[PDB]
Amino acid sequence: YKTENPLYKDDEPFAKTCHTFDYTREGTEKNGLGYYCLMGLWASIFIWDSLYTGATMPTGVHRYVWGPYFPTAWF
Amino acid sequence: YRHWHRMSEDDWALPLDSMPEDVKTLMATPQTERGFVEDYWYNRIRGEATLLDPEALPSKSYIALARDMGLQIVDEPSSHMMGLIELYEYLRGASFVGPFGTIENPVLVPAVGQERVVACTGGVGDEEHFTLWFRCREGFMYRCGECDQIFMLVRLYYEDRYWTQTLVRDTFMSDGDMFDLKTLERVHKMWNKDEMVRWEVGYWAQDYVLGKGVLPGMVEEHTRVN
Amino acid sequence: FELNINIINYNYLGIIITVIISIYIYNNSNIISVYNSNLLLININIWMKYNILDMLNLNVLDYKILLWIVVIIISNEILLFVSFYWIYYHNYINYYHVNILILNSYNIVYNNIILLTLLSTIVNIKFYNYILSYYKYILSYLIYYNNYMFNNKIILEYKNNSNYTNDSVYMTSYFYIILLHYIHIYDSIILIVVYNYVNYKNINNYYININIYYHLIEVLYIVISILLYL
Amino acid sequence: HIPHPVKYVGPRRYGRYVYGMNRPPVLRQVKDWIDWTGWNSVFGGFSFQVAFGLMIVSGVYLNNYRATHTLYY
Amino acid sequence: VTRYPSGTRTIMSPYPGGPVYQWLRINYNYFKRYQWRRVGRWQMRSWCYWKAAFYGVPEWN
Amino acid sequence: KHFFTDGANDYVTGWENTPPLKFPASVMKPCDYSMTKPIPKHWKLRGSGIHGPENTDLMKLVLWNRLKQKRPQREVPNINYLKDSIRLELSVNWWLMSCIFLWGPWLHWGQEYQKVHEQPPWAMKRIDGLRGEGYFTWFLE
Amino acid sequence: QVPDVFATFGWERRLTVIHHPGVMAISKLLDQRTVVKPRATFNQELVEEIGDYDEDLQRKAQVALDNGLAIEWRVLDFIDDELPRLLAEKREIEKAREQVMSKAPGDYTQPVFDSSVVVPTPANLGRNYPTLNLPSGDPTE
Amino acid sequence: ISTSETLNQKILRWLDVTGMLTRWHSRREFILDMDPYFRKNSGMWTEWERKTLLFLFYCCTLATPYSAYLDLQELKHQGTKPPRPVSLESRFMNQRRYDFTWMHPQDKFCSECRPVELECKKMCFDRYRSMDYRMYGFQRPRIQTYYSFSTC
Ligand SMILES: CCCCCCCCCCCCCCCCCC(=O)OC[C@H](COP(=O)([O-])OCC(O)COP(=O)([O-])OC[C@@H](COC(=O)CCCCCCCCCCCCCCCCC)OC(=O)CCCCCCCCCCCCCCCCC)OC(=O)CCCCCCCCCCCCCCCCC
Ligand SMILES: CCCCCCCCCCCCCCCCCC(=O)OC[C@H](COP(=O)([O-])OCC(O)COP(=O)([O-])OC[C@@H](COC(=O)CCCCCCCCCCCCCCCCC)OC(=O)CCCCCCCCCCCCCCCCC)OC(=O)CCCCCCCCCCCCCCCCC
Ligand SMILES: CCCCCCCCCCCCCCCCCC(=O)OC[C@H](COP(=O)([O-])OCC(O)COP(=O)([O-])OC[C@@H](COC(=O)CCCCCCCCCCCCCCCCC)OC(=O)CCCCCCCCCCCCCCCCC)OC(=O)CCCCCCCCCCCCCCCCC
Ligand SMILES: CCCCCCCCCCCCCCCCCC(=O)OC[C@H](COP(=O)([O-])OCC(O)COP(=O)([O-])OC[C@@H](COC(=O)CCCCCCCCCCCCCCCCC)OC(=O)CCCCCCCCCCCCCCCCC)OC(=O)CCCCCCCCCCCCCCCCC
Ligand SMILES: CCCCCCCC/C=C/CCCCCCCC(=O)OC[C@H](COP(=O)(O)OCCN)OC(=O)CCCCCCC/C=C/CCCCCCCC
Ligand SMILES: CCCCCCCC/C=C/CCCCCCCC(=O)OC[C@H](COP(=O)(O)OCCN)OC(=O)CCCCCCC/C=C/CCCCCCCC
Ligand SMILES: CCCCCCCC/C=C\CCCCCCCC(=O)OC[C@H](COP(=O)(O)OCCN)OC(=O)CCCCCCC/C=C/CCCCCCCC
Ligand SMILES: CCCCCCCCCCCCCCCC(=O)OC[C@H](COP(=O)(O)O)OC(=O)CCCCCCCCCCCCCCC
Ligand SMILES: [Zn+2]
């Protein structure tokens, strides 16, 4: 006969009834890419604030190749 | 039931030390005169004596076989009583939900006493109304003043007693032919020989019939330090 | 059938315990208070005896009721610490520029964190054994050694500190927050001294309570360590 | 809870210990153990100290070295 | 296959060990099992907080 | 899991709302009679009709929940369950390892540097003439 | 005709259900742990895994597998001596199964076989096996 | 030296002097090391649970010596704590409305000293001793007593 080691079997599913438990569409099982992006931004802000102290006090002279109403100027 | 705790060790079997030492009188006592411990060992001794005799089982009718094991044959009266007992026990820790009650099929409200408090919540959906509590007393067909649902009290009563599993057994089960101690001895020798004891309840039971501490090793078995 | 609950009709410990409390107020000697505290300990033990005897009722909801009571107690302990943190941070604007020596961030914090982490690991192993229906004798004595070091370190720190409660609100809050944590460590000693193996196992409320409580004490110290030492 | 299979894909048995013969390299054994018991506990346990250590020790460059070379006065 | 007394022979090496090693292994095994664990057995059995709760309570029939 | 929950982590009584998936539907099934076809008018109500042990599935659920409590061998769970049972224990152990082998070395290094240079290696050196170690957590300055 | 019976479980808290009298008889028979015995059947893969935990059992388990024996674990410890009886026992059990299965319906006569080699049976109740949990080797060697 | 084993086997043997490695690699050796009452339940353990338990147990015990070393260094540090400058009594420093007596409501020992101000108490105890009233403490040189953690 043939057998499966219980330790490596898959988790049993929730029973399908009138009262069925379902977590498949919740998206709460694990941290997603958005969470790891927040971590990346936190690291970037932490490094950036220390590296460039004058960033919070930017220069006021404005020089635009295509003026201030051109999209590249805004960013 | 969900409101019961874990099964105890006794819920499965009893220790042999609880076996009554006067086995000869135990097997002759009528069922109505046997206590919980006495009844347990009467059934186990008599039940295992028939089950440990393979050559006789095929020729034994189910009625006789059920009697030997102490199992009660079901009939409409006994089934009715047992069913209402379990419903009462279930409702101790479970919700009370069922079909809408009418004159033809009143809501059944099991009770041991003459009275039990009940609430009516109306029908389903919009027909459901606020809880209306009332005292459901025996002998009246109660009608909710709001939804006109019909309630009735069912009493688990019988001859100055309330229905219990033991009461049902005593009322309906009939003692058969008196247990023969020769069968106990015959089965005892079948499974217990030359220091091998594969039928231990019979070994103890046979020892008690012979007095106490007669069979090999039983004196050492009964000697305790505390 | 039977009643859902086996009612308790009478009790006399409540009167004794309440009177014991009053004796603290009406004392004329602090020696009476010391002996009064022993009476309180004795009578509280009797109350714990009644809880164990209630197991005979075989009531499924008894475990749940006590567990949620502990949850409420844990919340009260957390909120009590919050008030001390509130007191500490209210005067934050007056700290760090007064002529007092604040604690170092290298020695005390590291060894205490390491020491208290070991305490958590010991309790975790106790929980694992409790899951496996198993026991290890040495574990309890590791806790006692752990508690011995904690007492020895805290006693020396207070005695060798060169600033006093009356020097500044900073010092008062430091001493008080550290004492409050110690008292909760001592309460843990009170609980853990009776740890044994009971054969009814996972229906024993004591095991889950001890695991929750020890975890709370350790996490509270992390907050204290960040606030005061780091 | 979402049911899911066991992710462990390493060897399930090394065989009976016979004076440490016919067994994998030590580093491979350490990797197998963590696979068997779960990397999630490792990452969670080490995450706090790694975050604190990096933040403090990064100041050696961010706070000390850069500041000396970047002071407009 | 030869079975040695539990805790007396190592399985890590084919060589049982030298006299000092054997003395340390045998005597720690004895000290743990028959000397140190006396204290634990004494605390677990003779001073159980939960047993003391049922002292004087009638037996359960 | 550590905490007791009546619905999921019910280890005090072991009650389970549904039977195991091993049993065939004929042997035992979850208690669901929501799909029962309409009752013919000529049928008459014999039982109470009340939700309870008269229903076969509920009776079998109650029976199994009591008789499952004795089993010859363990019902071995998969490694995923075993990991979850001691998730906190394993993580606290790894946290202890991190404190010993990560925090300890750099904390020791900082104190040694502080001895020679009067301030931790992760702090700006002062020019104001005040003596002492100064701050430790630089990013909270 | 098979009458229905009440089956009750529990000592102080008693649960009653309707059951098959024959099934209950089998249930109580299987509770006679000294009479009705569980027996193990091996496969090559499982036998190999046993060696990881008990080398001696692996060798004895291999013998049982090679002869296709369903064997009790206690007997397996003495398979070196019990093998000739176990082979004889296997043949007698197979003979009895063939006879009873092949018999026409309603024929409940006992099978014809040599019960002296089948254990546990009234003809042979088995041997008093001594415990093998004792050490034989000297630690200092 | 013994040449009947490899170097790795020799190292493993000595690390196994208390049997830790043997119990890890043998289920039988582990269960037999349990006391009989708890060995009854050992059959239900999976190998994953057994080895995981040992891993947690060994990590804890192996880390205890390290914590002891840290505690000893802490005790030595406190035993020889360098003196600090005497505090200048600033605007809001050392404010008192009443004497310190909460420790001794009736005896009122060292009413002027703070609860853990050892040097103040020492001089206060000396006054009481000079008044023929005994008091315990502060009399033995630190280097002449055990467990002081102040010896050279
Ligand atoms: C040639 C010999 C070489 C020896 C080298 C030294 C080795 C010393 C090892 C000491 C380890 C102590 C660990 C303490 C934590 C608790 C351990 C534990 O759980 O025990 C359970 C164990 C059994 O418990 P159980 O409940 O029955 O069973 C539970 C399990 O089921 C079953 O439990 P288990 O069997 O799995 O237990 C595993 C293990 C778990 O723990 C570990 O494995 C941790 C190992 C940590 C290593 C620490 C080494 C420290 C050495 C430092 C040296 C520094 C020198 C500096 C020099 C400076 C120069 C300027 O526990 C033990 O084995 C503990 C030690 C048992 C000895 C008991 C007998 C009394 C003490 C004998 C000491 C002999 C020393 C000889 C030295 C000779 C040198 C040539 O408990 C006991 O045996 C009872 C209590 C006593 C145990 C602690 C004894 C402490 C002895 C310390 C000796 C070293 C002192 C160094 C001083 C240096 C000053 C400068
Ligand atoms: C920056 C670096 C430094 C960081 C420092 C951090 C410092 C943190 C300090 C924390 C101190 C320690 C506290 C916890 C000690 C125990 C630890 C432990 O054993 O953990 C492992 C263990 C893990 O459990 P497990 O079952 O093995 O879980 C397995 C898996 O994890 C998966 O489990 P699962 O997900 O399947 O779920 C099962 C488990 C999952 O649960 C847990 O495992 C709990 C884990 C908590 C860990 C602590 C994280 C921090 C929580 C912060 C909460 C903030 C509350 C809001 C504050 C607002 C302020 C304005 O459920 C339970 O165990 C149920 C426990 C009972 C909960 C009762 C909650 C009552 C309060 C409800 C909210 C009240 C406000 C309502 C407002 C809205 C009104 C409309 O946790 C427990 O079993 C602990 C439960 C017993 C203690 C509960 C204490 C509740 C206190 C409630 C306070 C409410 C105050 C409300 C007023 C406030 C404003 C005035
Ligand atoms: C050309 C220029 C180029 C320039 C290049 C520059 C390069 C720069 C590189 C920068 C790199 C940045 C990277 C950012 C992205 C990160 C992505 C990532 O992985 O994020 C997620 C990652 C991990 O998150 P995750 O994925 O969710 O974790 C996975 C888990 O396995 C989830 O699984 P789990 O949930 O199952 O986990 C286990 C969990 C399972 O839970 C359970 O089992 C259930 C119960 C849970 C509740 C527990 C209740 C309480 C328990 C009681 C027991 C306590 C024991 C301890 C007691 C202690 C007593 C003292 O249990 C636990 O974890 C908790 C129990 C374990 C022990 C807890 C110990 C206490 C914790 C609280 C205190 C923490 C503070 C301590 C402070 C120190 C001490 C005071 O997050 C982080 O690592 C945080 C991000 C940090 C960012 C820092 C940025 C600043 C630093 C920059 C440094 C470099 C700058 C150098 C200069 C450059 C100049 C140019
Ligand atoms: C604060 C300062 C630093 C403090 C650091 C503290 C560190 C504490 C670590 C503690 C570790 C315990 C290790 C236990 C090893 C047990 C094995 C063993 O050695 O058994 C031998 C042997 C076994 O015999 P057997 O079992 O019959 O074997 C016969 C077989 O046929 C043949 O079978 P076999 O061949 O297998 O048996 C022999 C085999 C047995 O051994 C092995 O094969 C070992 C295999 C397992 C190894 C696993 C790792 C063990 C743990 C390592 C810990 C490393 C610590 C590193 C510390 C660094 C500190 C900087 O090989 C050996 O015997 C080699 C032993 C190697 C010992 C290494 C000692 C290094 C000392 C370094 C000192 C550095 C000082 C720096 C100062 C700087 C100042 C500026 O019996 C003993 O253990 C003998 C005990 C009696 C010893 C008497 C010692 C007398 C000392 C007199 C001193 C007088 C001073 C006067 C001063 C005057 C001033 C004016
Ligand atoms: C001043 C700050 C506070 C300190 C002063 C004293 C405060 C005293 C208040 C004590 C409150 C106690 C509340 C307890 C609620 C939880 C009870 C509980 O779960 O106990 C049961 C639980 C498990 O029992 P089982 O039988 O398995 O199951 C129970 C039934 N299912 O048992 C335990 O918790 C065991 C407890 C053992 C240790 C008892 C120690 C008592 C300590 C009292 C301290 C008094 C000190 C007084 C000092 C006064 C001067 C400062
Ligand atoms: C072919 C390529 C080979 C490359 C090999 C690379 C080898 C690199 C080895 C690096 C070793 C680094 C060791 C650092 C140890 C520092 C120990 C230390 O500071 O101890 C003190 C401190 C406690 O001191 P306190 O006085 O209390 O002060 C702090 C709290 N108040 O204790 C600790 O830190 C204990 C923790 C020890 C950490 C040990 C780290 C070991 C790292 C090994 C790395 C090996 C890498 C190998 C790479 C191989 C690539 C082929
Ligand atoms: C067999 C004997 C065993 C004895 C040992 C084991 C048991 C130990 C029990 C736990 C002990 C916990 C003690 C808690 C109080 C500690 C007091 C303390 O340290 O206070 C001082 C510390 C810092 O002070 P400084 O000296 O200025 O620090 C300068 C450093 N050189 O903090 C304080 O001053 C605050 C003091 C708060 C004390 C609160 C304790 C409760 C006292 C209540 C008294 C009530 C009396 C009135 C009548 C009612 C009686 C109930
Ligand atoms: C009562 C007090 C409690 C303590 C105080 C809490 C205050 C803050 C609490 C916030 C919530 C905490 C949990 C967050 C969980 C999480 O990460 O949640 C992760 C989620 C994504 O979820 P999933 O990945 O799981 O699907 O992220 C988000 O929804 C938002 C964070 C992602 C990144 C946002 C980017 C912000 C951009 C800002 C501008 C940057 C400019 C850069 C210029 C170069
Ligand atoms: Zn109504």
TrEMBL record, chain A:
Organism: Perkinsus marinus (strain ATCC 50983 / TXsc)
Membrane recorded as keyword: yes
Record keywords: Membrane, Transmembrane, Transmembrane helix
Regions that span the bilayer: 33-52
Top-level taxon of the source organism: Eukaryota
Protein name per UniProt: Uncharacterized protein
TrEMBL record, chain D:
Name under which the protein is recorded: Ubiquitin, putative
Organism: Perkinsus marinus (strain ATCC 50983 / TXsc)
TM annotation in the entry: 42-62
Tree of life domain: Eukaryota
TrEMBL record, chain F:
Protein name, UniProt field: Uncharacterized protein
Organism: Perkinsus marinus (strain ATCC 50983 / TXsc)
From TrEMBL, chain H:
Disulfide bond residue pairs: C113-C120
Name listed for the protein in its UniProt record: Merozoite surface protein, putative
Naturally occurring in which organism (per UniProt): Perkinsus marinus (strain ATCC 50983 / TXsc)
